[PDB]
Amino acid sequence: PSSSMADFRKFFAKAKHIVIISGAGVSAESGVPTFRGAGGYWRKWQAQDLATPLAFAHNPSRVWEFYHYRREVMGSKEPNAGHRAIAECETRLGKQGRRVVVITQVIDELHRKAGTKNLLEIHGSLFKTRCTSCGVVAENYKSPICPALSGKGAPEPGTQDASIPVEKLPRCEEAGCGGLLRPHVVWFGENLDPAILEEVDRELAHCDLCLVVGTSSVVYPAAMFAPQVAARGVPVAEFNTETTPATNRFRFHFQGPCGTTLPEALA
């Protein structure tokens, strides 16, 4: 994998449809707890525990406390240099007739916060709910999301479970349903939305340059988007603090934090 910024810039200057795949490293560079590293524990657990169908079926109140806390911290976190570079590039290139699109693995909406408009959130969003009864999805930014979660979600180890009864957790406001809401967040072991994936496949087919930023390239099928693209002639360039299992299959690899290497790459 090449590490020449000059070569990538030559592809970039000539690229017309740029696909950027961003992972949890970009949010971590904003101080956003990922609960996947190195990236924070929530009282005893990480996202491999609470972000599962298992955790929600066993203790939906604990799963809601977890996500309520993450919603609440997003009011203190800001987009970093990588977000701004990615957003600014999209606007500058959009005026030149060139399209930049961000396929993100994260749910904290920091890309949208920076001004990115072409955003595909393959794993959902902290600020969208889904009804476990009728399936309707809704944006939701209310703090707290429901009254019984007010002041809840404290992340400190040894903090007592809210144990909120299911009827007082966020409920579907669609008339006639009142079903139990869950975060519109793809959990481990759930199938991604086929419509979003069809939109992703459409972007991967028409793009002529691909960037993979802040991704450990171990979460599927998100780690499969890039190799499917490189195998069409399209250059793939990785921006990550470390080498991932998919490094040897990329045209470029730029070691470093995304906030250091992306502003130079997207300039």
Partner: peptide, 4 residues
Amino acid sequence: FSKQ
């Protein structure tokens, strides 16, 4: 394709 399920989320690993």
